[PDB]
Design a protein around this ligand. Sequence first.
Ligand code: HEM
Ligand SMILES: Nc1nc(N)c2ccccc2n1
Length: 289
Amino acid sequence: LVHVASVEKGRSYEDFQKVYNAIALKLREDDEYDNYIGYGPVLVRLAWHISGTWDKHDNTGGSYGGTYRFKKEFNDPSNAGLQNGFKFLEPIHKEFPWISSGDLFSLGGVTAVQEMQGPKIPWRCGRVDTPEDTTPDNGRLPDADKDAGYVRTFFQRLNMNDREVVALMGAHALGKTHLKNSGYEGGGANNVFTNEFYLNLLNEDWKLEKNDANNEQWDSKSGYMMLPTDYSLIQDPKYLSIVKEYANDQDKFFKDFSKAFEKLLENGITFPKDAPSPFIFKTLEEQGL
Ligand code: HEM
Ligand SMILES: Nc1nc(N)c2ccccc2n1
């Protein structure tokens, strides 16, 4: 099963920078969402969940086909809450109807990371919407109540290795869990992309508690939380070494996350040899906008 990137007809860097800018300006304007977190975190989670359905064995799922727009995927319990992200992106799509759905969802995540002061994430266009019958079944995204061996095995399906897994999970610096969506509860409100997930893992005094949904999670006296899968990154000695590396080197973390996130967003896509190079979008700040 081959998915060949096909550039939206006649479009170039400038076109996609306009789309980036519209998302970024909306991110800035819609500041009240989720107790003043704004939409950045949910857009990162959306880009992950539309990509994380991928299966390397048969090239099903993945970001290419934009299949989250179909009911089966939109209504995956693992995607609860992501409708907010979809609704945020709706006016962007109305304005730029030429961008594919996979391109828009993935670009939303790139734009969110960058606008939250994260690393630059090179991004490629050319995802093409595919029909409803190409929508992957529910159940391909990961459970949060498991251990390091689960995480490791899970991510092999997405062709990610230990360093790529630990880097990607640093996105849990962002936003929060919501009991109604996932059965986990959080009290953070962070919308700045940093390596603090790792620092918090290493520095807090974690206690294994049950939340109001009767699920276990790790909580600190200072009010932080970790999912069991987050905490597994310090229980496993291979993950732990990498957590320490990123806690001690912000730039290395940024560079590794950028690589891994781009790869996650591009899994399953064949880029023809004469495709455009990846685009690196300027932030609103860099443009003086
Ligand atoms: C073992 C893998 C992972 C598990 C089990 C997991 C689990 C979760 C859960 C349970 C939530 C809360 C959903 C809600 O209650 O609203 C969440 C949110 C989030 N996840 Fe993950 N996650 C994983 C990996 C990733 C990756 C790879 C990324 C992106 C690189 C990511 C980005 C996010 C972000 C940004 C949020 C916050 C959304 C918000 O504030 O609305 N996660 N994740
Ligand atoms: N601050 C914070 N901490 C986590 N462990 C987390 C996990 C999943 C999603 C968002 C998160 N936000």
